[PDB]
Amino acid sequence: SLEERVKEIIAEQLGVEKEKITPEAKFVEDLGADSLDVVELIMAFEEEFGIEIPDEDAEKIQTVGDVINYLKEKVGG
Ligand SMILES: [Cl-]
Ligand SMILES: [Zn+2]
Ligand SMILES: [Zn+2]
Ligand SMILES: [Zn+2]
Ligand SMILES: [Zn+2]
Ligand SMILES: [Zn+2]
Ligand SMILES: [Zn+2]
Ligand SMILES: [Zn+2]
């Protein structure tokens, strides 16, 4: 599913265990993402799902849930 694909991208990048990759988990505060990690995650989500995440929207992506909910409104699943 889209959800699992997103979680896998996050696990690959951060080396965090999937049990912690929940919808309300903050990339920075909960998953330990540093500034480079967040830039790389956004880049990865864009390339994987063939969409763009403009800077203004990227700044508003703080949790795993934000990414999933946003993507579900941009792709079919
Ligand atoms: Cl999809
Ligand atoms: Zn993988
Ligand atoms: Zn486990
Ligand atoms: Zn937290
Ligand atoms: Zn890199
Ligand atoms: Zn890009
Ligand atoms: Zn972009
Ligand atoms: Zn916007």
From Swiss-Prot:
Q: Which residues carry this modification: O-(pantetheine 4'-phosphoryl)serine?
A: 35
Disulfide bond positions: none
Q: In which pathway does it act?
A: Lipid metabolism; fatty acid biosynthesis
Q: Which gene encodes it?
A: acpP
Molecular-function GO term, any one: acyl binding
Which GO BP terms apply? lipid A biosynthetic process
Q: How is it modified after translation?
A: 4'-phosphopantetheine is transferred from CoA to a specific serine of apo-ACP by AcpS. This modification is essential for activity because fatty acids are bound in thioester linkage to the sulfhydryl of the prosthetic group.
Q: Give the protein's recorded name.
A: Acyl carrier protein
Record's keyword terms, sorted: Cytoplasm, Fatty acid biosynthesis, Fatty acid metabolism, Lipid biosynthesis, Lipid metabolism, Phosphopantetheine, Phosphoprotein
Q: Which InterPro entries does the entry link to?
A: ACP, ACP-like_sf, PKS_PP-bd, PP-bd_ACP, Ppantetheine_attach_site
Q: Name one Pfam family in it.
A: PP-binding
